From Swiss-Prot, chain B:
Gene it is expressed from: S
Domain of life: Viruses
Subunit structure, as described in the record: Binds to host ACE2. RBD also interacts with the N-linked glycan on 'Asn-90' of ACE2. Cleavage of S generates a polybasic C-terminal sequence on S1 that binds to host Neuropilin-1 (NRP1) and Neuropilin-2 (NRP2) receptors. Interacts with host integrin alpha-5/beta-1 (ITGA5:ITGB1) and with ACE2 in complex with integrin alpha-5/beta-1 (ITGA5:ITGB1). May interact via cytoplasmic c-terminus with M protein. May interact (via N-terminus) with host bilirubin and biliverdin, thereby preventing antibody binding to the SARS-CoV-2 spike NTD via an allosteric mechanism.
Consequence the record notes for mutating residue 37 to Q: In strain: Kappa/B.1.617.1
Organism: Severe acute respiratory syndrome coronavirus 2 (2019-nCoV)
Outcome of substituting residue 30 to N: In strain: 20A.EU2, Iota/B.1.526, Omicron/BA.1, Omicron/BA.2, Omicron/BA.2.12.1, Omicron/BA.2.75, Omicron/BA.4, Omicron/BA.5, Omicron/BQ.1.1, Omicron/XBB.1.5, Omicron/EG.5.1
Protein name per the record: Spike protein S1
Portion held of the full protein: 448 to 495 of 1273
Result, substituting residue 9 to L: In strain: Omicron/EG.5.1
Described purpose of this protein according to its UniProt entry: Attaches the virion to the cell membrane by interacting with host receptor, initiating the infection. The major receptor is host ACE2. When S2/S2' has been cleaved, binding to the receptor triggers direct fusion at the cell membrane. When S2/S2' has not been cleaved, binding to the receptor results in internalization of the virus by endocytosis using host TFRC and GRM2 and leading to fusion of the virion membrane with the host endosomal membrane. Alternatively, may use NRP1/NRP2 and integrin as entry receptors.
Disulfide bonds: 33-41
Chain segments carrying region Immunodominant HLA epitope recognized by the CD8+: 1-9
Amino acid sequence: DSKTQSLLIVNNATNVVIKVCEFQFCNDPFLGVYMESEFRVYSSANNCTFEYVSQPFFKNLREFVFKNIDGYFKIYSKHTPINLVRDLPQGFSALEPLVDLPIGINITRFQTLLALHR
Amino acid sequence: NYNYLYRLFRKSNLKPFERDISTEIYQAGSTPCNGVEGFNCYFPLQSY
């Protein structure tokens, strides 16, 4: 809510964006594709403290680990081609480090954001 | 100069490298803070 600061990470299939602000969240947030046509993410955004963007860049599996270590937000990533439907494919392979950030917010709850095709 | 402030009240300690920028009313007793300042409900910011 607007009472405390919060972290938003979003991808628009071409850019990855990180925002660290005292957002007021729309409690039913989603993205909608008709090419995108719905961007219900936040009710309000003010008092920004950090913002970052990137360059304009079942079938596949992407695994990540998100953790917090005394103000250091750590993000680890790995990607693999997967053709199965419901199993967890054994054959464990080594993960890798991706990102560290000094966002430094009190994180206790989290949610995932989707894209709905309409 | 009173453009500098410091927080006076918080219900718990802080972790290192934590940015405590909240301005909520602090409950100093058993009386709830019903969204308004009052006795034992001081504003947790003070002016240098």
